[model samples]
Target: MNIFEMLRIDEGLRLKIYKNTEGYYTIGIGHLLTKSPSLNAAKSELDKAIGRNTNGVITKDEAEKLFNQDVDAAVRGILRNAKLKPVYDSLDAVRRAALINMVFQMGETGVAGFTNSLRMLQQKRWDEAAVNLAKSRWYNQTPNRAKRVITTFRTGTWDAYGSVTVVYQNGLPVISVRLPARRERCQFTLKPISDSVGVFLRQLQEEDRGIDRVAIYSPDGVRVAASTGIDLLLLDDFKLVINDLTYHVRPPK
Candidate 1:
């Protein structure tokens, strides 16, 4: 199913899943009221602030306005209650959103502040970012929830990276390609039976070279790369017959 399907508004199941996953009570109005008024209310207010910024697109800014009106006090309350002042102080917008989303689900004090991850994110470092995300205490905390958010940021995809397998083949590497050591990276090993260039071209007209199991990892360790299974098989048809393979490898930003 799609992401909207997962988070789609089904009152009974939504609340049930939210409560189970977040370990807190949520009103149908989307208020996550928890045991601590300071932290919970701070979150509630932040939600309102976001809502306000989005013109009530997210609950009419009930929480956002509250926080905006009392920014200093609200922040102080959140920090004091959670006993973690450094958490929000250092993050920029995007990184903060990732962290706050985690905190909102796991509670302010649960996720160890995501220090390393935030740093990598701030630097726009994708490989390190994925590593830091996986290292979180909350990495496996709530299986579906954690995977959803992490996958969202790591793959630069809005939805989860489910069972889809990506495969890549090395096409006469002129320049070394760096790949991150994540299961997400799958590289294909190709062997051409015909050594003669002209013979290989003729033989190719007769039969297609089949690809084997997908192995993920770059021939050179620097950037992370991936290709879908269909793409790997298609690589044999794009080789350069001249000189050295000339290309530079860089991670997706």
Candidate 2:
């Protein structure tokens, strides 16, 4: 018999069972029960298992309290361990949300324990930071999960994963970039610029020509949003261009 078929309850009875079980077995271990009906009894058996698992150190009421407290503590511990308290203090609403979720899953030590990765973030070295994120123990431990979270962190858009747009131009792929919220403002290489042409013009007139290109090639080069042509407006349209000299003319309405 199919596994899910084993745990299959009458549709009418599902809600009642779910309600009585406090959504524990139904939500947590429903799949296993479906695979083996004998295990369907695990809903109640779990309590026994918990007793054995905890070596009888916890009563039922204590187990329930511990469950709730552990969930809360796990989330808080993740933030505290990752040193994300500063990120909480500084980041914008959206970025903060993503970071909180990530740290919660990986814990602070697992997430921030990557020395090179933390350094990249501290220096606003976005590409390097992303590379570091991908290479960390967290990524190796949970590749699929890590990819999803990393995409959220780098792109500033949550969910949609594989369906998210990836732009490529010429022979090179366009990098997916995000606007750093207030706290992350100094944590990434992409900085805001008010005057685009003026900055470029100044670079051409006053700054050494090689200096600009060399800076762009540097690890921190991509952090300056305007310099890379990846600001609020560009992200809105999802435009990807390779040539830096391409002039962006506003369309006449």
Candidate 3:
């Protein structure tokens, strides 16, 4: 009945990670992982990277926001990876939209499988591109889906169930972190490695009822960020020397 609701039905919901249709790491309606985070970074650091909550489920609104940004990145990725700047920049929005769909399902990297298709597209031979589009394992795998997109490539208009408008702008896609509104309380503090100039921290979130098992380093050993989910605590002042800097996680006091 509405925009995102329909999209949600199409994308589906899952609160856990599972290998996707392409057999790459993905979670939450085909969100691809560009890089896996370090499991030892701290306690729930991995989950934190993905915006999961205490119960490990991301909210609907959160997923929607993540999806929106990911799609934009995906489009930008197509341009950057396909090296279609000269012709892509001059193409109509509908044509650009066609490529966006390709990348979303097949990844910007995966599209290289259509090397010949990309070649024709770069030359702006619309009809030939569509024909070349048909001559691939990708196209053979899903002829109908390929036809719909190649139709848009030829007609210069986006067509889903009907002709749809593609919103776009020129240039590269920039990725950045965006967070939803939420409040968190922090517990524990590591102070005065110098009893003067210590720049390190280990802490806890009241929501988890324990010290987050985080160890931060500063100076040559500097810890600018830390997070943990395991229950652990600091008992006494400790000095950590690395390379050159000295950091002190002052004993819990």
Candidate 4:
């Protein structure tokens, strides 16, 4: 009947250590577990969101505490960020609960990224918020879940792993990718025609086959990455090969 009960049901309130559907050790209501260079890569904003030190198996009490802490933050975010406070505050418990859970899953900034949906809500446009939310990759990830969240209102369990982008910085290569949630990461594969970065650029200038070995890096961010020079220029798209996903890259329209 309460928001906590709803969240417990939605998150499948678990105890003991186990792997989530994504294959990461998740214990007690979705606390994440994993070994990634990035965890200690530095004290990053992302690491802090999902608990940096997830090496030890936690007790049931720890799980409940983590769960409560996340939910509380989500609650705080929804209150702190909503522009149309009156309209948002008036929403039914179920609708409010859905947003809180989303906060846990997506973090504060992500919840903010739902600009259009929140805008619609602020104006008290219920149906518009539902439709706008449903139109995104988030909606595509889990239709039934979104439907439930929206029935109170209609969600992604990836924003459907959208297109990738290849950015050229000076004479370097970078791959901008849209990854799924945390716990999931992508790996890069680099293939260069010549070992020298200088040679690679010269080939591109001369429009030679040597210039063809340009696309570099995998999905991460604009670092320098492309292939098929003539084809790349004309076709208006390139392929991005990451750990398990291939994204078709194109400039943002």
Best by lDDT: 4
Sort by TM-score, best first. Answer: 4, 3, 2, 1
Q: lDDT per residue, candidate 4, 4-80, as tens digits?
A: 64454345434345555545455556555443334332224224544655443444456668888877877777677
Clashes of 4: 14
lDDT by residue (142-204, candidate 2, tens digit) is 565566556555655533121112243542223322221212111112223443423543433
Candidate that beats the other on TM-score, 3 or 4, i.e. the better one: 4
TM-score of each: 0.34, 0.35, 0.47, 0.48
The TM-score obtained by model 3 is 0.47
Model 1 over residues 1-253: C-alpha lDDT tens digits? 2222222111111111134344554532234545443545545643554453332123323433332333334344446754334645654444444454554445555655666765666566756777677765577665545665675556554334222222334543122212222234222233333233333233322332332222322222122233233234234322111111111112211
Task: Select the stronger candidate by TM-score from 1 and 4.
Answer: 4
- Segments of candidate 4 deviating more than 4 angstroms: 16-19, 22-25, 33-56, 82-87, 154-253
Q: Lowest lDDT 10-mer window, candidate 3? A: 173-182
- Candidate 4 TM-score versus the reference: 0.48
**Per-candidate clash tally:** 13, 8, 11, 14
lDDT on C-alpha atoms for all candidate structures: 0.38, 0.37, 0.46, 0.50
Top model number, TM-score: 4
Give the Å shift of residue 110 in candidate 2.
Answer: 2.0
TM-score of 2: 0.35
Model 2, runs deviating above 4 Å: 1-71, 122-124, 159-253
